[PDB]
């Protein structure tokens with residue numbers, strides 16, 4: 001099992017995206033994980049449409065800019081028979097009419113895998129063997145908002161009160177011997193480490209990173 005993983009190096013990760021002032025994190029987390037799995041299956045990286053999920057998945061319990069869940073979105077994608085490319089259904093950060101076009105599909109899924117709750121070990125194995133994984137985290141603290149550099153360790157984090165869906169693309173150990181998760185956020189490149197955060201790993205599921213982790217099946 002690898003000591004470090006960076007799926008960005010292996011072509012499985014799209015550029016940092018920016019959700020702006022729309023509360024759509026779930027849709028970026030969803031597209032992140034499915035971009036990774038479509039890449040692993042197909043050999044092709046294709047950026048996928050967050051606006052398609054926002055616009056079209058309300059009957060799966062997703063409420064667009066008022067929040068949603070990654071598993072509900074993988075299910076919408078299964079039932080719908082695909083999700084459109086970013087290029088043909090670009091992100092608007094508003095609620096709009098469903099404009100899904102099956103001719104512009106960028107990826108399909110057949111379902112998903114939920115990693116057991118709290119299990120950072122099963123999360124590491126999924127990240128190592130499958131690829132980037134959708135995760136829910138407690139991103140509520142000032143320290144997360146202002147995060148710039150190094151390994152994020154917020155003692156005040158909840159492992160159970162989670163508000164922000166993001167993407168684990170890798171993991172490692174920093175030069176102080178501190179284990180971390182390499183996380184892709186959807187707050188654009190000016191946040192954190194060009195849009196990425198290192199979140200402390202094997203510290204009792206800090207910020208709930210393994211509380212609600214899943215990846216789609218293709």
Ligand SMILES: CC(C)C[C@H](NC(=O)[C@@H](O)CC(=O)O)C(=O)NCCCCNC(N)=[NH2+]
Pocket residue numbers: 019022023024025026066067068069070135136137162163164165
């Ligand atoms: C971890 C994330 C994905 C939770 C989700 N949050 C959001 O979608 C956005 O508000 C957050 C954001 O930063 O854009 C949310 O609040 N969804 C509502 C779900 C309703 C309750 N069901 C649950 N949590 N099983």
